[PDB]
Design a protein around this ligand. Structure first.
Ligand SMILES: CCCCCCCCCCCCCCCCCC(=O)OC[C@H](COP(=O)([O-])OCC(O)COP(=O)([O-])OC[C@@H](COC(=O)CCCCCCCCCCCCCCCCC)OC(=O)CCCCCCCCCCCCCCCCC)OC(=O)CCCCCCCCCCCCCCCCC
Ligand SMILES: CCCCCCCCCCCCCCCCCC(=O)OC[C@H](COP(=O)([O-])OCC[N+](C)(C)C)OC(=O)CCCCCCCCCCCCCCCCC
Ligand SMILES: NC(=O)C1=CN([C@@H]2O[C@H](COP(=O)(O)OP(=O)(O)OC[C@H]3O[C@@H](n4cnc5c(N)ncnc54)[C@H](OP(=O)(O)O)[C@@H]3O)[C@@H](O)[C@H]2O)C=CC1
Ligand code: SF4
Ligand code: SF4
Ligand code: SF4
Ligand code: SF4
Ligand code: SF4
Ligand SMILES: [K+]
Ligand SMILES: [Zn+2]
Lengths: 96, 48, 145, 45, 342, 176, 55, 60, 238, 115, 42, 155, 209
């Protein structure tokens, strides 16, 4: 979800938004900023949480060799769905 | 592609752009980082 | 070290003990060298961490949840040979080869602890406790780092 | 699955020519001179 | 200063000086040199261009990456100005046409647009403005060059309270159409000037002295409101220009005191060519008119910029006119013109 | 083993001198040169009709960096910065920061197109195949600035191509 | 390929060689651009035993 | 009679940057050394480095 | 492509056949070159007997490759100092008699034919084997092993941060470039980065000879000297 | 270990000697280099440019180095005499484009953190 | 041990003028040494 | 109408210039060889105007191919001024664009912008031979969108 | 050498260079300081500075050595060592297909009489050394700045010379000519600290000095 600034300046996922007083905004008129509308924060948020009944789940991320190293995910935290640092896919432990 | 459609994904562009240079749709370099040295925002009203 | 692997089975993942908003624990990376527990009980002189478990399942931590809070608490980060314990604020910010270490002394205390500054591209990332023995050895308190 | 990298066929490959094979084309040295003189005599006549 | 407007660097190409000098009409002479000076220590000089981008292409090398931001603009369009000076912390006016155009009445080039850019700049939120007047600016003078200059000079003065108005004398440079001009009577004819030159004393000034004046006026805070006059080191009676210029170029000296009556006719005939009015009726009495002393307003000398003598650098503009037999001749072979001055 | 080159000997007999004299007077090797070019005139040309015809390439082509994304949607680059360390021209400029979710994500990923060399080292660096060189070469520009790429352009390039480069690494990761 | 017969003998004669036997443009001898999965071999020392880096 | 082939008009301090980079990043310099026979330069660099390393390349 | 410790990537499937397709016909095009150039009297009279150089003068000037072999000198790097597998392959060394620009030109085109011979033998000699050394400290581990095993992860990580630790010392490993003798004086301090690498420029001495090969000769012979030297402005200028 | 090999200057006088004709040639060199190279620089400020270059380094006392600048200055002169050097090279000594670096501590302070 | 018209150089060697570094970069540049402290994490 | 007349003249002049450039080669490094393959029949450029007339005086566009050095700096520059207008320069490859692989070096100026006004930039190290043909084509269309006679009419 | 990772050693010629090294050492012991060979069958005999003439004149003319192919004239700066500049020769024997290499030590000022007599190939190399490292050589025919820019300052491969340099160039309109301003980089060279603090090779380790 891209957000706009008061001067109509759409913000990027990093949060950069040049204010009106910034002289560095003059390259922006007559032209445009390229904004990755697919904000990386919310195309992972809508992804569901898979249910695997094990204490440690591999996280290859699909594609076999095409993915991220198979860092093993610890699954015993009931209050925290264990997510992978590489791909961010949240993994869960069946509700006992 | 008529005999082999590319792997359909959500983030893929639904419409392939040309070389946008020359047109007002050009690209302009700009810092994508955030400023990390904020000022003191001096408070107002009284005098020493 | 070798140049390949011979492991075919799975691995073991440890629950990340959560202590401090200042030091981050990834306990799966721990090699159980127990340097943290000794630098705690002898140097810091405070009972904070343990080695709960047994065998492959023995884990370095506090069992019951706590928040280790010593004045020199930001020192176990450097003693840790692996990234099992890392610095939360500096985390995911800069990496060795970018940094150009510059040495100076601490000012937050009257000790004047010798420290190493970690400018990367025009700003300070992390503070390292330069070894000099008399003033600070190679340990600095949290308020300085 | 065995090794599948790019390999030459078991018979290797067709024997590839590499000699200097400039084909000698032309006419006899006297023949070129004779035909040159013959055209001149015909032209003169 | 603004969060990023704060200056930084050793005055190099990639050093931010914090001055955002949107110059108006920089595609000629003084515009070329000021941007060269503006871009030397590094500054976001937004140049609104109106001609073909090709003719503006040569301004690119004197700016760092992302510095010379050419912007489309039109004089008539009110919003055209407001877009190019919206973020510019300083505005340097340079608009003006020394010759005449049917679509651009001579009033406009010194009254309409100069007023049309001064009020928008003050409405935008700028700090400074520098509109370039003439050292001889005088409406009552028969010079439409002077007549339009003076009225526009006070308009921007009235419109902009901090309008640091600059009134340089007859500037000279590589493309000044003043030195290369005065070399051109030999090509055109027998030097049809008035009264053999013994009726007009002028004080030429080298452009870099002028251009260094504005940038020094930029850093000077007290320059606001004050109306500095940029004057050369020495004056020069008109005849001395003609013989000296014909000397530093090794041209056949053919002076002729053609009176003002017939010399006015050749002005319109030079405007007859519907591509460029080589000489105009305004330019007829422009050179006949002499330069007033104007001693009360401050000059560049007290501003830190000295004045370079004309005879110090003439062939730098005039070696082009020197023929092959004498292209190698420098100042020293040529006698200096009689310094009729203070 | 070796071999001379200019060791031919001219025969002095009546026959041999006649051919050489005929060659000198009646230019024959010159005509032989003429015949070579003329035979090539009637040879079909090999002029690729750009842009309508385009030259062949291989699934390994290197150019036009573009960050990719996982099938879920999150971008691949975890800011492991091996590409930065490897980059032999130091065209890459990466600054990391802990994202609000918790995992890393580069807040600044500029690769200067006119410092880069398209050596293909960067794809071999990141183990998450984050940055790759796409098949594009049709990004010539008219201003030096637009060559200076950033994170936003890199992602936009990735989303633009993705599908083409998705099959490219599928047919090449066996070799790698 | 392409060309016709009478043209071939023209360039065959002018060059004194048979150009139709082998030319300088690829028509059909080119290997298929898409190829089967290239199962690569392993290293000579790829073994779970007696391969210490001490050797 | 006398000839002086002045050079430097392309000069780049190739090994000056080679010192600051490591061996792998140094490899593209060699490909750009001779812009005619490029991989032959790669051959010389690879032989030199693996000669110091006391490691021979595989027969393939 | 060619990196310390083997070759980076493997040959794509079917490419070896394409090499055979090209090699089978490239012999024809060189017959076209030799017919167009060698026999024509214009090429000889303009280029033969031009820029001669005696064998002792050539070698003592630091010349190499086509400079020596063309000018009578009997020496080639592969035949004498066999580096890599060049000993196994067979070829001929086309040395010249006089050693002018023309003789060097013929020496180049005969090496072209000899190059085709070497291509023929090696292409039919392709082994079953890996592309890079089985030492992860010098060669990057396989991408399949990259994301599977920890040792491979570290070894590629460190190899791609600082590289590899090269034992100290120095060497002058030199091989013949298709232009001349190309060598490097790679002295290593022992860190992960080189200390000093002075690259032998094969044209460095070759361009030094422009003084005499153009001496006593026409102005147009100067470019003929350059052409037969094939002066490439990347090595003589570093 | 104080006794070391000399290049040309066995004593100070020979170092003083070589400086002499070096200036003799260079003083005779300024008027023409301007003339041929079309430099817009009068002869006078060309001559004393050589002058203050000459004592911009005339402070060292080691005889081994002074003659090294002699040959360095010697051959900087040779490269100029035969139109090898161009307009940019001759002018390069005549520093033009940069503003004078700061003189008073006030000017050091106002520019930036630089000393 | 090296007798070839050797000059008894009693003054400390000053090669600063040959290297031709800018004058602002030879005086206004404090130059310092030390042996690096070990990276405490390593 | 007058604007139509100046439009037809603008098209006639623009179509001639864009379609018949006479580039002059200024290759200095490996960027020269790959453009020099555009001369090879695979990506023939003489198919559209750009021909062998060379003769830097008789040249419209200059292609600066390869690394630019400080000692090369003035001699290249003086070529540019001697080159009659309409003169445009094409920046070939990472080195001529912004210094590329030798950006941090003492004998190279970072980019040709510091010397000549660059009208078009072709990335690559080296750019593929056909990619320059595109760069020439996009420069050709750049000339197509030129309003020299139009802008004169407004004046 | 059944293992294919390490390169095989070759002992027969390894002993041969050492025998030849002693053979050269005994003949001219006035100038040979020390001689040694490495693992990769590369022998190096070390000479004194004033020894450029006879040692090469030896190798160039000896009936049993006859090393005539001059390979390269390199220099290696070592700031620690007093004679930091180390001029390195390299010769190849045509008949005996071997590579000799002689190197000396030299200060910034101390000269070397030009070895153009033994090998005129050194002449053109000799220009580069004074350009590239700056070491002047005595009685050289014409020792010129040939590879660096015209009127350059200093010696770039002295390890005290910045990689970026001291002067940058640009075309300036107000002078219509290229002006050499001091460098002002758009980006600073991000140096990388690439030195593992653990022992790399116990073999070549320097003992406590
Ligand atoms: C002069 C010689 C006589 C005229 C040209 C004769 C000719 O071209 O013959 C065809 C053909 C052309 O050369 P080729 O290399 O054999 O063609 C190979 C392919 O068939 C070529 O394959 P292709 O795909 O090109 O075949 C189709 C081609 C076929 O084109 C033709 O047949 C040419 C004539 C078209 C009308 O037509 C086109 O491509 C359409 C565009 C035509 C362009 C303009 C042609 C102008 C011709 C002359 C006009 C008057 C001047 O030549 C012959 O068959 C024999 C040689 C010529 C003999 C002429 C009589 C004696
Ligand atoms: C439709 C178009 C039809 C015409 C096409 C062009 C015809 C002419 C050019 C090709 C001629 C044949 C090419 C050939 O075989 O060349 C090699 C051959 C042989 O070249 P050679 O150099 O091998 O000579 C061999 C014979 N000896 C050794 C004795 C010298 O060329 C000839 O035979 C040429 C013969 C005629 C030469 C006439 C020259 C003088 C002309 C005066 C004016 C009349
Ligand atoms: N000696 C002298 O010549 C002196 C001159 N002046 C004044 O200084 C100013 C600049 O001088 P100089 O630089 O030499 O002049 P030039 O003729 O070289 O350049 C004038 C500039 O004004 C711009 N301009 C003028 N009118 C318009 C308009 N209506 N719309 C858009 N742009 C416009 C031109 O743009 P474009 O090129 O696109 O038309 C051009 O950039 C002029 O007003 C001049 O009279 C002051 C004192 C002395
Ligand atoms: S110091 Fe680190 S690695 Fe060692 S036991 Fe403690 S957490 Fe584990
Ligand atoms: S860097 Fe070290 S501590 Fe961190 S994951 Fe890798 S091996 Fe473990
Ligand atoms: S291709 Fe090479 S130079 Fe370009 S960004 Fe990747 S690693 Fe850097
Ligand atoms: S190497 Fe790949 S994963 Fe690492 S920072 Fe670069 S793009 Fe991201
Ligand atoms: S951009 Fe690349 S190919 Fe072009 S000159 Fe530079 S290094 Fe060579
Ligand atoms: K740690
Ligand atoms: Zn995962």
């Amino acid at each position: 979800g891209v957000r706009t600034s008061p001067t109509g300046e759409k913000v990027t996922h990093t949060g950069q938004a040049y204010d009106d007083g910034d002289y560095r905004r003059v390259r922006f008129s007559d032209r445009q900023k390229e904004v990755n509308e697919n904000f990386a924060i919310d195309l992972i948020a809508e992804q569901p949480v898979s249910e695997v009944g094990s204490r440690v789940i591999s996280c290859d991320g699909g594609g076999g060799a095409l993915g991220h190293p198979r860092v093993y995910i610890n699954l015993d935290k009931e209050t925290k769905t264990g997510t992978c640092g590489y791909c961010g896919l949240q993994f869960r432990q069946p509700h006992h | 592609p008529t005999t082999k459609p590319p792997t359909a994904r959500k983030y893929i562009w639904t419409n392939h752009k040309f070389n946008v240079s020359g047109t007002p749709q050009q690209y302009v370099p700009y810092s994508t980082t955030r400023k990390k040295i904020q000022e003191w925002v001096p408070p107002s009203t009284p005098y020493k | 070290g070798s140049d390949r692997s011979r492991f075919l089975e799975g691995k073991r993942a440890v629950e990340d003990k959560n202590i401090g908003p200042l030091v981050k624990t990834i306990m799966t990376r721990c090699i159980q060298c127990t340097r943290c527990i000794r630098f705690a009980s002898e140097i810091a002189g405070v009972d904070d961490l343990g080695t709960t478990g047994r065998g492959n399942d023995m884990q370095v931590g506090t069992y019951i949840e706590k928040m280790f809070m010593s004045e020199l608490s930001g020192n176990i980060i450097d003693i840790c040979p692996v990234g099992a314990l890392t610095s939360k604020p500096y985390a995911f910010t800069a990496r060795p080869w970018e940094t150009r270490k510059t040495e100076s002394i601490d000012v937050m205390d009257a000790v004047g602890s010798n420290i190493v500054v970690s400018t990367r591209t025009g700003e300070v990332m992390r503070i390292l406790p330069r070894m000099h023995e008399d003033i600070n050895e190679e340990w600095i308190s949290d308020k300085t780092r | 699955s065995k090794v599948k990298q790019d390999m030459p066929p078991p018979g290797g490959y067709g024997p590839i020519d590499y000699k200097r094979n400039l084909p000698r084309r032309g006419l006899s040295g006297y023949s070129m001179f004779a035909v040159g003189i013959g055209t001149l005599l015909f032209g003169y006549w | 200063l603004h969060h990023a407007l704060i200056p930084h660097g050793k005055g190099g190409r990639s050093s931010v000086s914090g001055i955002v000098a949107t110059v108006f009409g920089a595609t000629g002479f003084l515009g070329r040199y000021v941007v060269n000076h503006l871009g030397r220590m590094g500054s976001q000089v937004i140049v609104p261009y109106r001609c073909e981008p090709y003719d503006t292409m040569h301004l690119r090398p004197m700016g760092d990456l992302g510095q010379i931001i050419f912007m489309e603009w039109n004089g008539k369009d009110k919003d055209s100005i407001r877009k190019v000076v919206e973020h510019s912390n300083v505005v340097i006016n340079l608009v003006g046409r020394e010759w005449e155009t049917k679509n651009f009445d001579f009033e406009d080039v010194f009254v309409k647009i100069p007023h049309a850019i001064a009020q928008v700049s003050k409405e935008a939120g700028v700090e400074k403005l520098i509109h370039i007047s003439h050292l001889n600016a005088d409406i009552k003078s028969p010079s439409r060059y002077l007549r339009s200059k003076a009225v526009g000079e006070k308009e921007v003065r009235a419109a902009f309270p901090e309008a640091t108005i600059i009134k340089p004398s007859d500037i000279f440079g590589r493309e000044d159409r003043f030195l290369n001009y005065f070399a051109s009577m030999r090509w055109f004819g027998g030097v049809p000037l008035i009264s053999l030159g013994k009726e007009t004393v002028k004080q030429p000034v080298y452009i870099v002295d002028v251009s260094k004046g504005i940038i020094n006026a930029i850093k000077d805070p007290d320059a606001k409101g004050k109306t500095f006059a940029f004057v050369g080191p020495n004056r020069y009676l008109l005849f001395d220009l003609v013989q000296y210029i014909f000397a530093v170029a090794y041209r056949p000296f053919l002076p002729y005191p053609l009176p003002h009556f017939a010399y006015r006719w050749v002005g319109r005939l030079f405007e007859v060519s519907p591509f460029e009015p080589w000489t105009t009726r305004d330019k007829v009495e422009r050179v006949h008119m002499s330069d007033m002393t104007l001693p009360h307003l401050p000059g560049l000398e007290d501003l830190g910029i000295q004045a370079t003598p004309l005879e110090l650098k003439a062939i730098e503009v005039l070696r082009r006119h020197r023929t092959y037999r004498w292209l190698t001749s420098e100042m020293e072979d040529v006698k200096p013109a009689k310094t009729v001055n203070i | 083993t070796y071999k001379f080159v200019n060791m031919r000997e001219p025969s002095m007999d009546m026959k041999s001198v006649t051919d050489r004299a005929a060659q000198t007077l009646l230019w024959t090797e010159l005509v032989r040169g003429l015949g070579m070019t003329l035979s090539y005139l009637f040879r079909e040309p090999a002029t690729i009709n750009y842009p309508f015809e385009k030259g062949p390439l291989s699934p390994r082509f290197r150019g036009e960096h573009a960050l990719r994304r996982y099938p879920s949607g999150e971008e691949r680059c975890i800011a492991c910065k091996l590409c930065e360390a490897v980059c032999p021209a130091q065209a890459i400029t990466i600054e990391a920061e802990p994202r609000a979710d918790g995992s890393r994500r580069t807040t600044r990923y500029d690769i200067d197109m006119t410092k880069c060399i398209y050596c293909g080292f960067c794809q071999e660096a990141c183990p998450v195949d984050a940055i790759v060189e796409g098949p594009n070469f049709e990004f010539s520009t008219e201003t030096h600035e637009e060559l200076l790429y950033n994170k936003e352009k890199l992602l936009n390039n990735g989303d633009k191509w993705e599908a083409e480069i998705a099959a490219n690494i599928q047919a090449d990761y066996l070799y790698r | 390929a392409s060309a016709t017969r009478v043209i071939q003998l023209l360039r065959n004669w002018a060059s004194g060689r048979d150009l139709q036997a082998k030319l300088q443009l690829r028509y059909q001898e080119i290997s298929k651009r898409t190829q089967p999965p290239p199962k690569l071999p392993v290293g000579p020392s790829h073994k779970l035993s007696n391969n210490y880096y001490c050797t | 009679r006398k000839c002086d082939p002045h050079i430097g008009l392309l000069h780049r301090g190739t090994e000056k940057l080679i010192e600051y980079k490591t061996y792998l990043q140094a490899l593209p310099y060699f490909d750009r050394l001779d812009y005619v026979s490029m991989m032959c330069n790669e051959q010389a660099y690879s032989l030199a480095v693996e000669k110091l390393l006391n490691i021979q390349p595989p027969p393939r | 492509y060619i990196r310390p410790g083997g070759v980076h990537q493997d040959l794509p499937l079917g490419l070896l056949d394409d090499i055979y397709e090209f090699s089978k016909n490239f012999s024809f095009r060189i017959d076209e070159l030799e017919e167009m150039l060698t026999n024509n009297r214009i090429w000889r009279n303009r280029t033969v007997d031009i820029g001669v150089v005696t064998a002792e003068d050539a070698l003592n000037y630091g010349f190499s490759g086509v400079m020596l072999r063309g000018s009578g000198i009997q020496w080639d790097l592969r035949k004498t100092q066999p580096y890599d597998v060049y000993d196994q392959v067979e070829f001929d060394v086309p040395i010249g008699s006089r050693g002018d620009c023309y003789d060097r030109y013929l020496c180049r085109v005969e090496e072209m034919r000899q190059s085709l011979r070497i291509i023929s033998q090696c292409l039919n000699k392709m082994p079953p084997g890996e592309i890079k050394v089985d030492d992860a400290k010098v060669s990057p581990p396989k991408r399949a092993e990259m994301k599977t095993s920890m040792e491979s992860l570290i070894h590629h990580f460190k190899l791609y941060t600082e590289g590899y630790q090269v034992p100290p010392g120095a060497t002058y490993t030199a091989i013949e470039a298709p232009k001349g003798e190309f060598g490097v004086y790679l002295v290593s301090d022992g860190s992960s980065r080189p200390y000093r690498c002075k690259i032998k420029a094969p044209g460095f001495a070759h361009l030094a000879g422009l003084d005499k090969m153009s001496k006593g000769h026409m102005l147009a012979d100067v470019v003929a000297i350059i052409g037969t030297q094939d002066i490439v402005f990347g090595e003589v200028d570093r | 270990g104080t006794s070391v090999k000399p290049i040309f200057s066995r004593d100070m006088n020979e170092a003083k000697r070589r400086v002499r004709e070096l200036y003799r040639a260079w003083y005779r060199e300024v008027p023409n280099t301007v003339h041929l190279f079309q430099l817009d620089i009068s002869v006078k400020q060309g001559r004393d440019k050589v002058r203050e270059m000459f004592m911009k380094n005339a402070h060292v006392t080691d005889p081994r180095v002074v003659d090294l600048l002699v040959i360095k200055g010697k051959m900087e002169l040779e490269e100029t005499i035969n139109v090898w050097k161009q307009r940019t090279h001759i002018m390069r000594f005549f520093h033009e484009t940069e503003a004078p670096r700061p003189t008073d501590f006030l000017s050091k302070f106002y520019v930036g953190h630089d000393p | 041990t090296q007798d070839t018209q050797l000059i008894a150089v009693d003054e400390k060697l000053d090669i600063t003028t040959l290297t031709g570094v800018p004058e602002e970069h030879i005086k206004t540049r404090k130059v310092r040494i030390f042996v690096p402290a070990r990276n405490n994490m390593q | 109408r007058g604007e139509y007349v100046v439009a037809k003249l603008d098209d006639l002049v623009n179509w001639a210039r864009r379609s018949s450039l006479w580039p002059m080669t200024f290759g200095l490094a490996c960027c020269a060889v790959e453009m020099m393959h555009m001369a090879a029949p695979r990506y023939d450029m003489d198919r559209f105007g750009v021909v062998f007339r060379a003769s830097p005086r008789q040249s419209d566009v200059m292609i600066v191919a390869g690394t630019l050095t400080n000692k090369m700096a003035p001699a290249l520059r003086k070529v540019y001024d001697q080159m009659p207008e309409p003169r445009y320069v094409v920046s070939m490859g990472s080195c001529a664009n912004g210094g590329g692989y030798y950006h941090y070096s003492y004998s190279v100026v970072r980019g040709c912008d510091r010397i000549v006004p660059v009208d078009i930039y072709v990335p690559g190290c080296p750019p593929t031979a056909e990619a320059l043909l595109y760069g020439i084509l996009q420069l050709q269309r750049k000339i197509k969108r030129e309003k020299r006679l139009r802008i004169w009419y407004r004046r | 050498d059944t293992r294919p990772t390490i390169r095989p050693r070759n002992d027969v010629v390894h002993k041969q260079l050492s025998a030849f090294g002693q053979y050269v050492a005994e003949i001219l012991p006035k100038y040979v300081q020390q001689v040694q060979v490495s693992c990769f069958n590369e022998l190096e005999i070390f000479i004194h500075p004033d020894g450029v003439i006879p040692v090469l004149t030896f190798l160039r003319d000896h009936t049993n050595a006859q090393f005539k192919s001059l390979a390269d004239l390199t220099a290696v700066d070592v700031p620690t060592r007093q004679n930091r500049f180390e001029i390195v020769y390299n010769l190849l024997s045509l008949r005996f297909n071997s590579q000799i290499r002689v190197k000396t030590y030299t200060d910034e000022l101390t000269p070397i009489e030009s070895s153009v007599t033994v090998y005129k190939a050194a002449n053109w190399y000799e220009r580069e050394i004074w350009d590239m490292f700056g070491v002047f050589f005595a009685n050289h025919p014409d020792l010129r700045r040939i590879l660096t820019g015209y009127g350059f300052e200093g010696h770039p491969f002295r390890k005290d010379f910045p990689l970026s340099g001291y002067v940058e160039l640009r075309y300036d309109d107000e002078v219509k000519r290229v002006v050499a301003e001091p460098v002002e980089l758009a980006q600073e060279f991000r140096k990388f600290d690439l030195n593992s603090p653990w022992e790399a090779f116990p073999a070549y380790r320097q003992p406590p000095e």
